[PDB]
Amino acid sequence: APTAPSVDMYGSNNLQFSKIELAMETTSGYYDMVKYHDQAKITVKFNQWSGTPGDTYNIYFDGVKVATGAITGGQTTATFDYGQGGLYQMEIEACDATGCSKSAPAEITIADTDGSHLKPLTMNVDPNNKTYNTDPSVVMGTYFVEWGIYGRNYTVDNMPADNLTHILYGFIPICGPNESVKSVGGNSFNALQTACRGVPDYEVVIHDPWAAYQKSFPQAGHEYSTPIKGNYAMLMALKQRNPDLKIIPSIGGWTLSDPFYDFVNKANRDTFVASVKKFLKTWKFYDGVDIDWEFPGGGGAAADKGDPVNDGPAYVALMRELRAMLDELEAETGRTYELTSAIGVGYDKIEDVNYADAVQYMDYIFAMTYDFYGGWNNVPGHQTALYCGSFMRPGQCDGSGVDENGEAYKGPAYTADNGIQLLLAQGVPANKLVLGTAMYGRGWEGVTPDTLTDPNDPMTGTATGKLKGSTAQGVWEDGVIDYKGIKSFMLGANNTGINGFEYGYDAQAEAPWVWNRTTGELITFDDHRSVLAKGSYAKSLGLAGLFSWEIDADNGDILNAMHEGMAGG
């Protein structure tokens, strides 16, 4: 036998390799930062000094031959392609006529974006999140937001994964027209422009690569040499821990929807869809695509856009082409891919798409059954109600009446059930709809008792302006408030009212509120009871399940209520 081969660790990159090179110390165009390879370029050096090195080498991973070549002297550098991620016990075998000598096994790491090379994530979940007899056939979705790792300080390991089947990662931008991104203020529009340099219009990109894959997370064991970090490496590890959990990219949303309005041009769709396939090939932990176009026909962040005539068909065509692309990805990988979309449920949003035509391609519609009322104006109302509250005027629920300035109503009122029914009437199968629960409140200030026309119902009053508060109370933007912030700063431990706030519940609409008679502060939100009503309603209608916006704002209560209201028959 030859001399035993000896592995030069330094000359073998310390046996660490990766299918994806990721810029770690700069912010640039998407393709200056992200380079993917189907075959990792593996390089192993070994030494057989002042001895008999033999004629040929073989390299095994877990006893399986992956590489072979000739030996010439005491220094052999072996290169070769490997296309599957993982950890492997690697062995070097030198052979010649008289037999074969081996190195001692050493662990080689081939990183890939499926997490195949990672140990299951170490969770750090608030224990208020209870343990449940999960039913894997019911949808329990939620949104996790890329920027929530900053001030909100809520990271992938805080997610109650065991109580989720569906994680929607918000949000993936589309390069092109994005004037809406500017009202978000800050660095946001500039971050987009940087990521889209060298990127053709209507291609998807990562908006914040620092959060996505750059930030070193200690609890995830990240270090300087670590080839993938940030949120994505954590989601990858999370798939190893929870393999059946669907993690799906969410494209668009409120401020990143502007480019969807050009998808009336099929060539822009062709470029988009293709970029979505490369995205999913590049980022293998994702399980499909969710389209959050707000909204065909208009009505979203851009007062500027919206085509009620042509947007609907563009969206149907997009779902077909996205479905057909995912079909051929399923053929290439053997995986199953899901296609979903979050939609408005006001009647004026719903009528702009023939969801019967598009649903044939989709797995789930996430019905955004919330933001019915809020601080953009001074009309109190249930923002996330199952049914129409008593504060609504006659013929206002169904849109048959006229408003309090004698003007007529143009469609049914903003409730979840008005929304669902309109979708069922359209032909959408009930077992593809997912009902939305809020994990935040919307609220006003200055709804003093004396603004009320019905003294039992502050939803009957008038506001002076948006709710105000601090970051620490969960108020990240005026007139909006995390549920956990409502819990600990307005509800209290017994849910009976603290710091001047009362509790109330509109049993007819299935909608809670908290109300401060003195400040006139009014908050509408989803609570334990109201989510229970949504569970019952979902079951009664054969709805696929429930989903929530946004997980960082929950404290446990809402997701708990979601499981409990879904339990049983």
Task: Report, in Å, the least distance between residue 317 CB and Ca ion.
Answer: 19
* Cβ closest to Ca ion, residue 297 vs residue 374: 297
Over the window 247 to 286, marking each residue x when it contacts Ca ion by CB under 5 A and - when it does not, the resulting string is ----------------------------------------
- Which one of 297, 312, 485, 556 is in contact with Ca ion (CB under 5 A)? 297
* Cβ closest to Ca ion, residue 296 vs residue 381: 296
Q: Per rule CB under 5 A, is residue 478 in the interface with Ca ion?
A: no
* Cβ closest to Ca ion, residue 188 vs residue 369: 369
- Which one of 93, 112, 258, 352 is in contact with Ca ion (CB under 5 A)? 352
* Cβ closest to Ca ion, residue 112 vs residue 352: 352
Name the segment binding Ca ion (CB under 5 A); options: 75-83, 340-348, 475-483, 506-514: 340-348
Inter-residue long-range contacts of 348-352, CB under 8 Å, 24+ positions, other chains counted: 348/297, 348/299, 348/410, 348/411, 349/295, 349/296, 349/297, 349/299, 350/419, 350/422, 350/423, 350/426, 351/297, 351/411, 351/422, 352/295, 352/296, 352/297, 352/308, 352/311, 352/312
The whole-angstrom separation of Cα 200 and Cα 203 is 6
Name the segment binding Ca ion (CB under 5 A); options: 89-97, 292-300, 401-409, 550-558: 292-300
Angle formed at CA 316 by CA 276 and CA 291, multiple of 5 degrees: 40
Q: With beta carbons less than 8 A apart as the criterion, state whether 437 and 526 touch.
A: yes
φ/ψ of 66, rounded to 5, equals -125, -10
* Cβ closest to Ca ion, residue 292 vs residue 352: 352
Name the segment binding Ca ion (CB under 5 A); options: 11-19, 266-274, 294-302, 490-498: 294-302
Task: Report, in Å, the least distance between residue 315 CB and Ca ion.
Answer: 13
Q: How many residues bind Ca ion (CB under 5 A)?
A: 3
Strand pairing report for 20-22 and 34-36 = antiparallel
**Among all residues, which ones are annotated catalytic?**
294
Task: Report, in Å, the least distance between residue 344 CB and Ca ion.
Answer: 8
DSSP labels, 449-505 = GGG-SSTT-GGGS--SEE----GGGT-SSTTEEEHHHHIIIIITTTTS--TTEEEEE
Task: Report, in Å, the least distance between residue 426 CB and Ca ion.
Answer: 15
* Cβ closest to Ca ion, residue 23 vs residue 356: 356
Name the segment binding Ca ion (CB under 5 A); options: 229-237, 295-303, 490-498, 556-564: 295-303
Residue type, 234: M
Task: Report, in Å, the least distance between residue 449 CB and Ca ion.
Answer: 37
**Tokens 């750059």 sit on residue:** 214
Residue of closest CB approach to Ca ion: 297
- Per DSSP (E only), the strands in 205-344 are 246-252, 288-292, 338-343
Angle formed at CA 294 by CA 330 and CA 395, multiple of 5 degrees: 125
Task: Report, in Å, the least distance between residue 190 CB and Ca ion.
Answer: 31
Name the segment binding Ca ion (CB under 5 A); options: 61-69, 94-102, 268-276, 348-356: 348-356
The whole-angstrom separation of Cα 291 and Cα 366 is 10
Bridge partners, 58 (sequence order) = 68, 93
Over the window 409 to 438, marking each residue x when it contacts Ca ion by CB under 5 A and - when it does not, the resulting string is ------------------------------
Task: Say which residues have a Cβ less than 8 Å from residue 183's Cβ, sequence separation at least 6.
Answer: 255, 301
* Cβ closest to Ca ion, residue 351 vs residue 457: 351
Side-chain half-sphere CA neighbours of 286 within 13 A: 26
- Which one of 32, 96, 201, 348 is in contact with Ca ion (CB under 5 A)? 348
Cα 301 to Cα 169, 253, 258, distances in angstroms: 20, 9, 8
Task: Report, in Å, the least distance between residue 303 CB and Ca ion.
Answer: 13
* Cβ closest to Ca ion, residue 349 vs residue 432: 349
**Neighbour tally for 477: CB within 10 Å:** 9
Task: Report, in Å, the least distance between residue 343 CB and Ca ion.
Answer: 12
Interface ranges with Ca ion (CB under 5 A): 297, 348, 352
